[PDB]
Amino acid sequence: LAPPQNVTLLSQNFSVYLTWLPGLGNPQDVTYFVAYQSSPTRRRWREVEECAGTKELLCSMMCLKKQDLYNKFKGRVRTVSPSSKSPWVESEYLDYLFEVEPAPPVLVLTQTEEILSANATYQLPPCMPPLDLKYEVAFWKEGAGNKTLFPVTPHGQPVQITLQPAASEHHCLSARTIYTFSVPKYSKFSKPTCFLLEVP
């Protein structure tokens, strides 16, 4: 059996995944088995239960038992059929704190009088290390040339916007996450949430 190809450990939305491509030899209804390294001070390849014999070309590698996201670790995949097992193919190391890719927040909007508050929230993997997330809110009139950007704000705090009573136009908000460990990582801006402003 031809081993999986282009075996890659990557991060998306705060999580980690292993992906790959089928072996050079291209039999069918072949399955795949996946494993990961545990912590460097108690290392052992462990299998990912849910990916065992998968026919998919990826595997979630987040919040695994005995995983240590504070150090490098690799995943490995092999191709398997009844008629053979391929050799293992390892990924590069992935070092979560320095390579995780943040998702945009989901903004929660409340309004009181002339103050509109836009508050970031996130669905975070339960094992995630406590990252310092901040976010940057963009605000604008639908179709307008320029946008306004509010000061970068810590997860935990809302962004406060003063409304103009008479501006009953369709407006729009969006935000991205800034995650800075040793170098700033920016997520994309979230999909705009839009609404008709009305003060009284």
Partner: protein, 143 residues
Amino acid sequence: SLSPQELASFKKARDALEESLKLKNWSCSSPVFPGNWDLRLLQVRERPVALEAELALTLKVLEAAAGPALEDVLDQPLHTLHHILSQLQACIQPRPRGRLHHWLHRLQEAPKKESAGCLEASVTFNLFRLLTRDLKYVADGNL
């Protein structure tokens, strides 16, 4: 919190230490940091004490590792560690036993029973969890 530059310099040192470990034996007879070590398992009053003990051990091991080959890359990291240790000591106000006593005992014994390679590998791989997780829990209940 720790600035991007402090964190970049820790990473450079952590990677250089990990490299040097590929070329020695660093088996440990017992885990230097107990496998379940986690300040969130301790009472708020106990957390600074645990944090201090791992910090002092970390400093002592990395200083002994800081030979002519590594002294340049370890200089910022040691300076930062000293400063964290001093800030922490300034805030530490001074019959069955629990996890805190057991863990301090394991830390205290490690330098007596284990090889230098073992102590270096153990503080090296514990370093970013110390800096990002343990330091954070303590800074919640600061006193």
